[PDB]
Enzyme design. Structure first.
Site, PDB file in Angstrom:
ATOM      1  N   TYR A 267     -28.549  27.403 -31.181  1.00  0.00           N
ATOM      2  CA  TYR A 267     -30.323  27.611 -30.377  1.00  0.00           C
ATOM      3  C   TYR A 267     -31.016  25.831 -31.384  1.00  0.00           C
ATOM      4  O   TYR A 267     -31.788  25.322 -30.761  1.00  0.00           O
ATOM      5  CB  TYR A 267     -30.546  28.583 -31.353  1.00  0.00           C
ATOM      6  CG  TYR A 267     -32.923  28.780 -30.061  1.00  0.00           C
ATOM      7  CD1 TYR A 267     -33.014  28.748 -29.491  1.00  0.00           C
ATOM      8  CD2 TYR A 267     -32.634  28.397 -31.963  1.00  0.00           C
ATOM      9  CE1 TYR A 267     -34.532  28.906 -29.399  1.00  0.00           C
ATOM     10  CE2 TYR A 267     -34.714  28.265 -31.768  1.00  0.00           C
ATOM     11  CZ  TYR A 267     -35.711  28.395 -30.173  1.00  0.00           C
ATOM     12  OH  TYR A 267     -36.243  27.828 -30.608  1.00  0.00           O
TER      13      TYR A 267
ATOM     14  N   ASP B 120     -40.005  24.010 -31.433  1.00  0.00           N
ATOM     15  CA  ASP B 120     -40.275  24.941 -32.280  1.00  0.00           C
ATOM     16  C   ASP B 120     -41.198  24.513 -33.120  1.00  0.00           C
ATOM     17  O   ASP B 120     -40.216  23.447 -33.500  1.00  0.00           O
ATOM     18  CB  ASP B 120     -38.409  25.217 -32.284  1.00  0.00           C
ATOM     19  CG  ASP B 120     -38.341  26.550 -32.918  1.00  0.00           C
ATOM     20  OD1 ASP B 120     -38.939  26.669 -33.964  1.00  0.00           O
ATOM     21  OD2 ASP B 120     -37.762  27.977 -32.747  1.00  0.00           O
TER      22      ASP B 120
ATOM     23  N   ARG C 149     -44.422  35.971 -20.346  1.00  0.00           N
ATOM     24  CA  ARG C 149     -45.353  35.734 -21.991  1.00  0.00           C
ATOM     25  C   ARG C 149     -45.202  33.733 -22.006  1.00  0.00           C
ATOM     26  O   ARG C 149     -46.426  34.037 -21.064  1.00  0.00           O
ATOM     27  CB  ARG C 149     -43.579  35.737 -22.473  1.00  0.00           C
ATOM     28  CG  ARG C 149     -42.553  37.260 -22.719  1.00  0.00           C
ATOM     29  CD  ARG C 149     -41.495  37.451 -23.301  1.00  0.00           C
ATOM     30  NE  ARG C 149     -41.220  36.637 -24.736  1.00  0.00           N
ATOM     31  CZ  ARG C 149     -41.680  37.298 -25.439  1.00  0.00           C
ATOM     32  NH1 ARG C 149     -42.320  38.374 -26.457  1.00  0.00           N
ATOM     33  NH2 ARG C 149     -41.235  36.461 -26.746  1.00  0.00           N
TER      34      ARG C 149
ATOM     35  N   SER D 165     -48.074  13.908 -16.577  1.00  0.00           N
ATOM     36  CA  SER D 165     -46.604  13.762 -18.102  1.00  0.00           C
ATOM     37  C   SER D 165     -46.042  15.451 -17.721  1.00  0.00           C
ATOM     38  O   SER D 165     -45.925  15.672 -15.938  1.00  0.00           O
ATOM     39  CB  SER D 165     -48.261  13.808 -18.551  1.00  0.00           C
ATOM     40  OG  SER D 165     -48.261  15.546 -18.851  1.00  0.00           O
TER      41      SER D 165
ATOM     42  N   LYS E  61     -33.015  22.431 -29.893  1.00  0.00           N
ATOM     43  CA  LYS E  61     -34.880  22.211 -29.174  1.00  0.00           C
ATOM     44  C   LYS E  61     -34.577  21.234 -30.591  1.00  0.00           C
ATOM     45  O   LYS E  61     -35.355  20.404 -30.375  1.00  0.00           O
ATOM     46  CB  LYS E  61     -35.374  23.809 -30.504  1.00  0.00           C
ATOM     47  CG  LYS E  61     -35.406  24.601 -30.025  1.00  0.00           C
ATOM     48  CD  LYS E  61     -36.255  24.559 -28.784  1.00  0.00           C
ATOM     49  CE  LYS E  61     -37.221  25.747 -28.119  1.00  0.00           C
ATOM     50  NZ  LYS E  61     -37.033  25.115 -26.522  1.00  0.00           N
TER      51      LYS E  61
ATOM     52  N   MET F  25     -29.754  23.296 -32.588  1.00  0.00           N
ATOM     53  CA  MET F  25     -29.345  22.436 -32.048  1.00  0.00           C
ATOM     54  C   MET F  25     -30.167  21.720 -30.892  1.00  0.00           C
ATOM     55  O   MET F  25     -30.494  20.549 -29.958  1.00  0.00           O
ATOM     56  CB  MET F  25     -27.531  22.295 -32.046  1.00  0.00           C
ATOM     57  CG  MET F  25     -27.299  22.019 -32.932  1.00  0.00           C
ATOM     58  SD  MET F  25     -24.920  22.690 -32.884  1.00  0.00           S
ATOM     59  CE  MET F  25     -25.362  21.576 -32.032  1.00  0.00           C
TER      60      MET F  25
HETATM   61  N1  LIG Z   1     -42.115  33.319 -28.757  1.00  0.00           N
HETATM   62  C1  LIG Z   1     -42.189  32.213 -29.424  1.00  0.00           C
HETATM   63  O1  LIG Z   1     -42.370  33.007 -30.616  1.00  0.00           O
HETATM   64  C2  LIG Z   1     -41.290  30.585 -29.530  1.00  0.00           C
HETATM   65  C3  LIG Z   1     -41.382  30.788 -30.641  1.00  0.00           C
HETATM   66  C4  LIG Z   1     -41.227  28.940 -31.440  1.00  0.00           C
HETATM   67  C5  LIG Z   1     -41.019  28.407 -29.711  1.00  0.00           C
HETATM   68  N2  LIG Z   1     -40.930  29.473 -28.452  1.00  0.00           N
HETATM   69  C6  LIG Z   1     -40.650  28.383 -27.484  1.00  0.00           C
HETATM   70  O2  LIG Z   1     -41.725  28.445 -26.582  1.00  0.00           O
HETATM   71  C7  LIG Z   1     -41.156  28.446 -24.825  1.00  0.00           C
HETATM   72  C8  LIG Z   1     -41.366  30.233 -24.994  1.00  0.00           C
HETATM   73  O3  LIG Z   1     -41.222  31.052 -25.696  1.00  0.00           O
HETATM   74  P1  LIG Z   1     -41.287  32.722 -25.138  1.00  0.00           P
HETATM   75  O4  LIG Z   1     -41.083  33.607 -26.011  1.00  0.00           O
HETATM   76  O5  LIG Z   1     -42.118  32.829 -24.011  1.00  0.00           O
HETATM   77  O6  LIG Z   1     -39.109  32.851 -24.140  1.00  0.00           O
HETATM   78  P2  LIG Z   1     -38.689  33.758 -23.757  1.00  0.00           P
HETATM   79  O7  LIG Z   1     -39.942  34.897 -23.308  1.00  0.00           O
HETATM   80  O8  LIG Z   1     -37.648  33.899 -24.817  1.00  0.00           O
HETATM   81  O9  LIG Z   1     -38.109  32.467 -22.676  1.00  0.00           O
HETATM   82  C9  LIG Z   1     -38.912  32.299 -21.756  1.00  0.00           C
HETATM   83  C10 LIG Z   1     -37.860  32.108 -19.955  1.00  0.00           C
HETATM   84  O10 LIG Z   1     -36.426  31.533 -20.079  1.00  0.00           O
HETATM   85  C11 LIG Z   1     -35.969  32.012 -19.002  1.00  0.00           C
HETATM   86  N3  LIG Z   1     -34.300  31.595 -19.594  1.00  0.00           N
HETATM   87  C12 LIG Z   1     -33.882  32.169 -20.029  1.00  0.00           C
HETATM   88  N4  LIG Z   1     -32.195  31.851 -19.855  1.00  0.00           N
HETATM   89  C13 LIG Z   1     -32.151  31.023 -19.214  1.00  0.00           C
HETATM   90  C14 LIG Z   1     -31.246  30.230 -17.908  1.00  0.00           C
HETATM   91  N5  LIG Z   1     -29.829  30.234 -18.550  1.00  0.00           N
HETATM   92  N6  LIG Z   1     -32.076  29.839 -17.549  1.00  0.00           N
HETATM   93  C15 LIG Z   1     -32.991  29.875 -16.564  1.00  0.00           C
HETATM   94  N7  LIG Z   1     -34.317  30.120 -17.751  1.00  0.00           N
HETATM   95  C16 LIG Z   1     -33.728  31.056 -18.521  1.00  0.00           C
HETATM   96  C17 LIG Z   1     -36.364  32.864 -18.771  1.00  0.00           C
HETATM   97  O11 LIG Z   1     -36.659  33.553 -17.358  1.00  0.00           O
HETATM   98  P3  LIG Z   1     -36.339  35.147 -16.471  1.00  0.00           P
HETATM   99  O12 LIG Z   1     -37.168  36.048 -17.128  1.00  0.00           O
HETATM  100  O13 LIG Z   1     -37.237  34.498 -14.979  1.00  0.00           O
HETATM  101  O14 LIG Z   1     -35.158  35.472 -16.716  1.00  0.00           O
HETATM  102  C18 LIG Z   1     -37.216  33.612 -19.662  1.00  0.00           C
HETATM  103  O15 LIG Z   1     -38.611  35.137 -19.052  1.00  0.00           O
HETATM  104  C19 LIG Z   1     -39.760  29.333 -24.949  1.00  0.00           C
HETATM  105  O16 LIG Z   1     -38.656  27.061 -25.198  1.00  0.00           O
HETATM  106  C20 LIG Z   1     -39.744  28.330 -26.460  1.00  0.00           C
HETATM  107  O17 LIG Z   1     -38.319  28.563 -27.692  1.00  0.00           O
HETATM  108  C21 LIG Z   1     -41.335  30.488 -28.361  1.00  0.00           C
HETATM  109  N1  LIG Z   2     -37.088  31.214 -26.539  1.00  0.00           N
HETATM  110  C1  LIG Z   2     -37.431  31.953 -27.407  1.00  0.00           C
HETATM  111  N2  LIG Z   2     -37.292  30.619 -28.277  1.00  0.00           N
HETATM  112  C2  LIG Z   2     -37.970  31.736 -29.570  1.00  0.00           C
HETATM  113  C3  LIG Z   2     -38.111  31.696 -30.764  1.00  0.00           C
HETATM  114  C4  LIG Z   2     -38.167  32.023 -32.061  1.00  0.00           C
HETATM  115  C5  LIG Z   2     -39.167  33.477 -31.979  1.00  0.00           C
HETATM  116  C6  LIG Z   2     -39.693  33.788 -32.614  1.00  0.00           C
HETATM  117  O1  LIG Z   2     -39.732  35.072 -32.338  1.00  0.00           O
HETATM  118  N3  LIG Z   2     -38.770  33.623 -33.921  1.00  0.00           N
HETATM  119  C7  LIG Z   2     -38.721  34.728 -34.948  1.00  0.00           C
HETATM  120  C8  LIG Z   2     -38.156  35.388 -35.121  1.00  0.00           C
HETATM  121  C9  LIG Z   2     -37.190  35.316 -36.396  1.00  0.00           C
HETATM  122  C10 LIG Z   2     -36.033  36.024 -36.799  1.00  0.00           C
HETATM  123  C11 LIG Z   2     -35.151  36.628 -35.799  1.00  0.00           C
HETATM  124 CL1  LIG Z   2     -33.902  36.772 -36.107  1.00  0.00          CL
HETATM  125  C12 LIG Z   2     -36.182  36.587 -34.241  1.00  0.00           C
HETATM  126 CL2  LIG Z   2     -35.473  37.208 -32.969  1.00  0.00          CL
HETATM  127  C13 LIG Z   2     -37.271  36.284 -33.872  1.00  0.00           C
HETATM  128  C14 LIG Z   2     -38.752  33.501 -30.453  1.00  0.00           C
HETATM  129  C15 LIG Z   2     -38.327  32.840 -29.659  1.00  0.00           C
HETATM  130  S1  LIG Z   2     -37.687  33.319 -28.434  1.00  0.00           S
END
Ligand SMILES: NC(=O)c1ccc[n+]([C@@H]2O[C@H](COP(=O)([O-])OP(=O)(O)OC[C@H]3O[C@@H](n4cnc5c(N)ncnc54)[C@H](OP(=O)(O)O)[C@@H]3O)[C@@H](O)[C@H]2O)c1
Ligand SMILES: Nc1nc2ccc(C(=O)NCc3ccc(Cl)c(Cl)c3)cc2s1
Ligand SMILES: NC(=O)c1ccc[n+]([C@@H]2O[C@H](COP(=O)([O-])OP(=O)(O)OC[C@H]3O[C@@H](n4cnc5c(N)ncnc54)[C@H](OP(=O)(O)O)[C@@H]3O)[C@@H](O)[C@H]2O)c1
Ligand SMILES: NC(=O)c1ccc[n+]([C@@H]2O[C@H](COP(=O)([O-])OP(=O)(O)OC[C@H]3O[C@@H](n4cnc5c(N)ncnc54)[C@H](OP(=O)(O)O)[C@@H]3O)[C@@H](O)[C@H]2O)c1
Ligand SMILES: NC(=O)c1ccc[n+]([C@@H]2O[C@H](COP(=O)([O-])OP(=O)(O)OC[C@H]3O[C@@H](n4cnc5c(N)ncnc54)[C@H](OP(=O)(O)O)[C@@H]3O)[C@@H](O)[C@H]2O)c1
Ligand SMILES: Nc1nc2ccc(C(=O)NCc3ccc(Cl)c(Cl)c3)cc2s1
Ligand SMILES: Nc1nc2ccc(C(=O)NCc3ccc(Cl)c(Cl)c3)cc2s1
Ligand SMILES: Nc1nc2ccc(C(=O)NCc3ccc(Cl)c(Cl)c3)cc2s1
Lengths: 252, 252, 251, 250
Positions: free
Chosen positions: A158, A145, A14, A139, A162, A160
């Protein structure tokens, strides 16, 4: 040696994979940190090492808070120095994400350790370890988020974590500036939607985004990380760049 | 011929100059808007045209608020289309900046026209004219101010104009997102100081910056503008990137 | 008849002024304390002399541990036992000290105190308060006006106060359906830490635009009283600064 | 004697509820109005019947122009002429209507009305207030939704953002004179007269705390707090009074 080196947490898949790939394409040697995703981590490191040998290693760690988390974070940074002799960049990307309703099979203390540990406490300890092991363009980039002020219902812990990560970004930019270490954040809105989510629910979120009615690609997120680590961001510290297609500007 | 084109207001000198240079180095044809600085604007257009023929023109206009401001702003945008047949980028950089104390040779209504016209009204009217006229990567960058929430004493009108510009950045990002026009800001903290400011006063400001105890170069500000207009920022809209060396994080 | 409030860290300084002012307004109060037993009882005796059986004390350590959820549940229970209702929760208790990133409590203890007491205890108290629920129910969190311009080397403290902003907003949203409002009060310099030198104290007082002095505790409590009152029945998710302008002052 | 307050745009809706509630607290009031002459004089009659000689009206256009500074000076002057003092200024008057970026009034007029009433006139009134100077303060009516704005309302949103800057800059600059400057930011309160009832209901349903708009009185309660002796250390603060509306994602 003379290529810089970066640590990317939760880099198997991802967004964290897209960040490690883009750093590697820019010339970095990378530590791919993972927790459970062992097969995906080794497969990525293999792909990178095939492009340029001795340029990717994996490192396993749970980032849930406990009395050993400081040791595990020290070890992540240590693994970058053992493989590459230096550590120029830290990307705090790994994150736990799930609801914790206030009015309600994990214990609440497990939820706190996971959601606060991965999103905030591990970034703080890795930042301490990164900074303490210093001897160039150093850096840290925290994945934040864009929606922290308009949070999803029932996600208090979650959110809190972030918010705490925003405070870390600002406090550490301040304190590490004299060391020439910059600390910034990248704040997605919706990017890669959760694997568990149905298409119909994904589309509900996509339709909210003013810029294209679609989520960010992983690469679009990675682009902003690459900018902040670059020499084109050398006066930038304590800034959090939203990459959200306008989503946070949309009222209810 | 296939090169994109940009308008930069207040481009004869300092920050706007460095932005027009960097856009030109990236392959943009540029309209160099100026108010009073004719000789500097033409010097810059000539230097740019020496690098690549017919890639730079100048355009004179006062951006003070008046009855004629809407027509002047329409004409700036039109000048880009008449020179280059397209207008891909607008940079709202031109700015008046001077104290307007609340308690006691320009009249207050002139201060209002200049400080609110240059910093806010002219950006809005240029944004209107840019959008009305509209491989494509269309965007606007507004030059904001990282210190708007910790303002200099006795600068209320200047601070009002820069807050209004934040609102414009947000409102126009939301409204123009369906047209594929992204709208963002760059917010300097202390960059190029006045030439005639004593070094002893310049140093008082420089000493406040955590990252290097120095002001940003014009080029460092231009780097963040270049990022926002680039293909690496294609999901970014409604964002304001601070480029302030941590200044805004420092308590009194 | 009379509503009831829980004030954490209520033995001294700001939480004491909050409990007093709530009491003066007609609340029955639970005075929570950790180490300050003598002072907690002293205040309860003073309140009960004014109106009998209107003030009780409740001991609990608010450090994060496997027992914090049970301690937080007990604080809330104490209010229900004593008074049959709990209308107001004031999350005031707080640890405050530097945790430098580049170098004695262990780090994981500093995490338990600074993040437990300033954020996790507020979250668990909020959960117990909502679970146990016309009326005017609300929660007020003691935030910090200087959260975006933090003190040098105070990263954990700042993380916890930022987490407390996120709790304030998340809980305001999630509990609005129950008619529970959730707000904050954010002091700048108020009562300076007892530890702090007099010279450092005057340095800070000098920075404050409004009268060059710190807030009294009662000025903080005034904003708490406003937010729990019927004059704030439409206000939720708001954080009111009470800083004399301090956070507007550039470096 | 009793303290005195100016409330701009006080003939109707929220400005009216603020004037009523200041008057109930002890204040003498200037009821500023632009077009609403019948409603202004009728409120002033109502207030004076309760306590003689405690309310006057003052008519003025708050559109930006080269005479706006004289008109704002006149508003402050009218309080001093009637009551001999001016303790409180409430910047409540506001124009509100869409100004789409992509296409009766010229754009120069829209700028003058929306930026003049929401921002410039507050600044000029603040200047005149401060220049003519117990518990002195100013309260600006802001907008809780300034960062999640209505589609096609750029000029309005620009004015309200400028008003936030004014609240901060004037709080800083007037603090050595003992004048506090704060804001009250409604989300959805009294919905526009022009709005159909189905659109009113769409907005109500967005509000987490009760699925209803604020009453004008609930907005006024926050104004009353900020001018009170219980807010003496509060300056440069903006209190949202929005039922959680600004917290709700798209
Ligand atoms: N995806 C979105 O739409 C979105 C939106 C807002 C913010 N973000 C932020 O962007 C970043 C990446 O998003 P993402 O969707 O790629 O994240 P994700 O797929 O939800 O998680 C990324 C990785 O975090 C690791 N992780 C989870 N719990 C852990 C633990 N207890 N110890 C160590 N590693 C752990 C996992 O590694 P393993 O798979 O190796 O277990 C997972 O693959 C995150 O900080 C997220 O909050 C994402
Ligand atoms: N570690 C991760 N942090 C975030 C933060 C936000 C999102 C995202 O996809 N937000 C849209 C969203 C909105 C509502 C719900 Cl219920 C869900 Cl499960 C997901 C997904 C992830 S994965
Ligand atoms: N320098 C800093 O430290 C700093 C800090 C924060 C924010 N900023 C922002 O960054 C941007 C660039 O800063 P800067 O220091 O390069 O700006 P600057 O030198 O103060 O001004 C830029 C140009 O603005 C034009 N301008 C002024 N009044 C005008 C009017 N009435 N009509 C038309 N043009 C007018 C002038 O053009 P002519 O010379 O042709 O008359 C001037 O050269 C500004 O928006 C500024 O507020 C700068
Ligand atoms: N003073 C200021 O200028 C200022 C500035 C900004 C924000 N604030 C916020 O205002 C609130 C009150 O300020 P204050 O100066 O009155 O606070 P304080 O004196 O630093 O602490 C208040 C009480 O919190 C309790 N506490 C500390 N650690 C604890 C633990 N592990 N378990 C249980 N209770 C614990 C203590 O109770 P016992 O004594 O019973 O052990 C203490 O007396 C705090 O939330 C603070 O962060 C204050
Ligand atoms: N109602 C809400 O939901 C809401 C939401 C967010 C913010 N607010 C803010 O709260 C404040 C009060 O809201 P409201 O709904 O009561 O306001 P409103 O009814 O829209 O306007 C208040 C008064 O402003 C005066 N006004 C308009 N243009 C003027 C001009 N050119 N010169 C002088 N006065 C002028 C009018 O006076 P005359 O009638 O005498 O001409 C009008 O009655 C406003 O600042 C508003 O932006 C309200
Ligand atoms: N059009 C312009 N906008 C701005 C905004 C800020 C600054 C700047 O120099 N900020 C730091 C600063 C340095 C020195 C003094 Cl005296 C003051 Cl008041 C402010 C300079 C300019 S020039
Ligand atoms: N529980 C508590 N939280 C806080 C938050 C802030 C303050 C305060 O007085 N801050 C100003 C200040 C904080 C830290 C230092 Cl080192 C100096 Cl010198 C001055 C004091 C306290 S006590
Ligand atoms: N002077 C005034 N300022 C404002 C600001 C906001 C509102 C308000 O009604 N906001 C909700 C709303 C605003 C605009 C539209 Cl088009 C719709 Cl549908 C709903 C109403 C007013 S009246």
């Amino acid at each position: 040696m003379e290529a810089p080196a970066a640590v990317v947490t939760g880099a198997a898949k991802r967004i964290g994979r897209a960040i490690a790939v883009k750093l590697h394409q820019t010339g970095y040697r990378v530590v791919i940190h993972y927790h459970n995703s062992a097969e995906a981590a080794v497969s990525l490191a293999d792909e990178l090492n095939k492009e340029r040998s001795n340029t990717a290693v994996v490192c396993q760690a749970d980032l849930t808070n406990s009395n050993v988390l400081p040791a595990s974070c020290e070890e992540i940074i240590n693994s970058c120095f053992r493989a590459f002799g230096r550590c120029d960049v830290l990307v705090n990307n790994a994150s736990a994400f799930y609801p914790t309703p206030l009015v309600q099979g994990k214990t609440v203390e497990t939820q706190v350790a996971e959601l606060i540990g991965t999103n905030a406490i591990a970034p703080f300890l890795l930042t301490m370890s990164f900074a303490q092991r210093q001897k160039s363009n150093l850096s840290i980039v925290n994945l934040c988020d864009a929606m922290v002020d308009q949070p999803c219902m029932a996600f208090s812990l979650y959110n809190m974590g972030k918010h705490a990560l925003v405070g870390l970004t600002q406090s550490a930019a301040l304190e590490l500036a004299p060391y020439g270490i910059r600390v910034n954040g990248v704040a997605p809105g919706v990017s890669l939607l959760p694997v568990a989510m149905g298409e119909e629910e994904k589309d509900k979120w996509r339709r909210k985004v003013p810029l294209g009615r679609r989520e960010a690609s992983a690469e679009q997120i990675a682009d902003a990380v690459i900018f902040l680590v670059s020499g084109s961001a050398q006066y930038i510290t304590g800034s959090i760049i939203k990459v959200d297609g306008g989503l946070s500007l949309v009222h209810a």
